[PDB]
Subunit: 333 residues, 4 copies
């Protein structure tokens, strides 16, 4: 089983740690975050406004973070080249600071002894993967990879099923997306474009989504045929993809539901979900799926033009996919 270091103990860093504990699929052995000391990590891991108090034990002892009795080595390095991953036994590093998303920057972790780096965001040049969609294109020569974004992990499984069965001629999508840590509590200086500095709990905010440029990398057959944007809205977690697409082969809405349900029970089980219930965003809080198709909420204008809806816990579904990708990579070693 692969031993993991986490760089950036944030929303994703902490929920990747929870997912690793919940799934047992990888082992966290080290965490680096210069803004959160050991005692502070006890607090921030234990209490979570969105996902609730951790169901387990967490304490600081002998300089280590001890979760369910397992000690974790804690680093406090602002410069990732200074992190002694090898000494702590960290083989794979989750790069979840938000600020080292290029090959050049994320590769810093290789200097301290990490064997592979998984960027928890889209990358300008690291190869990007979505479990269930193109993870089989990974190979042992890729020491630096990206798990794309949470919107990309919601859109791409749904797009793949629809394209495989009916053929997407062209499509546009929107994600109605929960607020995130890059946004501001009140109108202030942005960090990525003017609209994104505006007060997050007051506003619907048009914004970019990583899926716009990533989906065509993860599904080359849809490059130039699909893109989209986001509206950030005042919820703390859970987002929803709104995919409007023209199909090559005619598809009754019942056939769409049928093939999506079949996919959710077979090859994409645990990745793509399917529901007909009268769900709202909070019903997906702490749901580990990448994408849950909402059959009741979609619209078929005609046999070749449809709107398809799919929910995703942008924090916890993505965090579980990070764990899944590392487990997959390790099985390939």
């Amino acid at each position: 089983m692969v031993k993991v270091g986490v760089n950036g103990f944030g929303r994703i860093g902490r929920l990747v740690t929870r997912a690793a504990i919940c799934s047992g699929k990888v082992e966290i052995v080290a965490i680096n975050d210069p803004f959160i000391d050991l005692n502070y990590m006890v607090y921030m891991f234990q209490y979570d406004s969105t996902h609730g108090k951790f169901n387990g034990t967490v304490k600081a002892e002998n300089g280590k973070l001890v979760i369910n009795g397992k000690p974790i080595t804690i680093f406090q390095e602002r410069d990732p080249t200074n992190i002694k991953w090898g000494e702590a036994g960290a083989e794979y590093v989750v790069e979840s600071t938000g600020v080292f998303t290029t090959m050049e920057k994320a590769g810093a972790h290789l200097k301290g002894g990490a064997k592979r780096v998984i960027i928890s965001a889209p990358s300008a040049d690291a190869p990007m993967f979505v479990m269930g969609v193109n993870h089989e294109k990974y190979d042992n020569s890729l020491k630096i990879v990206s798990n794309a974004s949470s919107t990309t992990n919601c859109l791409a499984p749904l797009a793949k099923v629809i394209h495989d069965n009916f053929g997407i001629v062209e499509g546009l999508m929107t994600t109605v997306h929960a607020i995130t840590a890059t946004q501001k509590t009140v109108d202030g200086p942005s960090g990525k474009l003017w609209r994104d500095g505006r007060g997050a709990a007051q506003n619907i905010i048009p914004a970019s989504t990583g899926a716009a440029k990533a989906v065509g990398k993860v599904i080359p057959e849809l490059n130039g045929k699909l893109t989209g944007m986001a509206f950030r809205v005042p919820t703390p977690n859970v987002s929803v993809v709104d995919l409007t697409c023209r199909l090559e082969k005619p598809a009754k809405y019942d056939d769409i539901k049928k093939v999506v349900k079949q996919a959710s029970e077979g090859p994409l089980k645990g990745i793509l979900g399917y529901t007909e219930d009268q769900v709202v965003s909070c019903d997906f809080n702490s749901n580990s799926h990448s994408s849950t198709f909402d059959a009741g909420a979609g619209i078929a204008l005609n046999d070749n033009f449809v709107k398809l809806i799919s929910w995703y816990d942008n924090e916890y579904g993505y965090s579980n996919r990070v764990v899944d990708l590392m487990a997959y990579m390790a099985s390939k070693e």
Copy 2:
């Protein structure tokens, strides 16, 4: 000025009264609401969480509501049949309770002496109108009419400009829509619309939009070619239309911007607006336009497939249009 009675002194009834009173296009002379007594009406009209305190005077005197010195007769009838509109001199009645939206129910106001009724919502059977789109189809034999919905009033002027210039082959739309009075503060009963009962400020909620069935009636050439749905999100006011459509004639995005800007400066001035600024929803609070095209937020996938974004103050833009529709109707008497 036509003399106006307001049935239902709610978000729309009060803001219709504000719009009328400030901009004397019509004269409010009577108000009925059995759940808001006279002294309570003073308070509810004076203070408004969303649009600020009324800039003017409001008081109770001699059993009438006096706004900027003009006395208004106050009724407290549950049954519209029993409201003495004629005795109060009300010629047109705004039917803004939300529960009398059919011809049969809204026509009760004629029994008390009203001459015409304007339903502030879509109607299963009353003829529907959107200022700037089909209001010249009104004729004087229509005693009961509908002003459609706020989403219809945002979508239809934009769809008209796009269809007139390039031809909409097919389209689907979403409105990211502020919470309204039909929603609930915490998970509660909602009759047969189960998602609408879930806690409004906690969730993104898929929902119907009145635009879905109304837009094909106000633009008959688009009937069956355009529909959509809503996501209710935790903001108190201001909504945004996201229109994805295929065009018959190819159009560069700059060509779309040019015809929309031209429409906003000509025949649709005051109804359809145009901006290139980096706006978010709060920038439209108390904006009286029906539809403001957001040039920067849209996406062209190719010359025949686009996503177009348009903002609307669902409370205040619609309330101004109710006033405008009545002023137009009165001008044709």
Copy 3:
């Protein structure tokens, strides 16, 4: 266990059911709610925006609501005198509609064969109880009782400990209180509680609290020496009491902490909690305590004048006390 019927399957009615299942202390055998039909009850019990999806099974079968394989009789009566509690085997009825809080109205359930009634709110005339404070004043003659309110259940255990140990000369309190079902999503009619109709997600709203008139009944030595009010603020659940009191015997703040912690570990265990952690409201979501003293948040002006802070899940803590009171009542039978 005593067999229980629930009148009003709302926030309290549903979480009383969850608390009963979690505790095993009582058995829900019947539920009445004319606004939630059988199939709708499945949905509202299964999905909860605040407390998450039910961890168990729930389905409708042969006209019963079946939770964890146990069937519950469902009634749909507006008028409580028509509910056949006796025939369904419901011995105690939880009166959680919010509209039958007097002895005369709540006594309707005895006509259908219920043996006792527990009003889930303060009552103008039914005896009121707070577990840990005055529950031993209950006796078998009381067929109609009240469990007071969630703020009373948070304030009264803390005031009891303070008063027993140091003597409360006089005090006033505030609860910063989550929004509830009586509030409105946007400015609307509230009846005679005018501030309570203002938009709940937009506003800090001064309001009454049931603790103001209840606390002097559950702690008679403090009647006229202690009262308070509320500010409703835009959170969906969890509230906090802010108790400012003058003490007869001087006490250092750490002396106060010691006696509260000692109370929390002894006779008030599970009712009064104690923490020194840097908590916020979400850390108490789904917490079954009546009152958790926040040692770090409070402040002393001097040895005889202090401000004491205590958290409470107003939904789930109160619901657990409703179950606890019924179990105590049943042990007295």
Copy 4:
């Protein structure tokens, strides 16, 4: 009009600018911010989620910010010591960044040619003034002064009136305070103030504040007799002071209302307001008062122990007092 430079174009700097233009009591001639370029300043000043779009013109021309046709010199200096206030004609400098609140640090603006510095925040060592309470203690030898905090400006005028008439023996205050820029959209790192990092729109968050202690310094006779704390709650603006105090002379609540109303109509006009209306927080958005007594929300436990409630727009009331303090200082030159 004294000519004013603004250091820092955060919320306070921008709203001081708006207050100055709206009131015409001073003339803004220069703004320094090293993080916000001139085109971005146009945008942040023009659009405001909380207070609405600026009602006037704002443009970038010739390297200056031109508001209502009057050009403003823009600087971008990291080091206040290098800002050329004198060349721009700025006589008073509003020091609003938060990081130069000591006399040694704020005095850096004197080296660039400014004559006086007004710190828009509490200061360890500069003299602090609350208009209406102790501004008469200003004198022309004072080159560096502080305008205290918003909460101190709300509590102090109320405490002055209550102490002048009845004598405050001791008091404890809570402020229920809107979200501010120091908070985080989702749980994130907050240095040594752990609770302040928790998701702002999700949580009621206890927080320390020196404001009550500080009014014991601006009103020396209350030194040692006041302290308090805060709860941060999910609203974007407007806060409320909750003062529980013991009085030396007995006072009926009607006596309290009378002397507060008298003060608000006389010497504290525009600073201390008085209402009996059924107000909520949004009713004070963009209200320029420092403190508005809420007569209906307070409680008299007895003639010597009361809870007094007073509202404040923590952004705009304070910004207007900064302008008023500068106008007062200039009148004594």
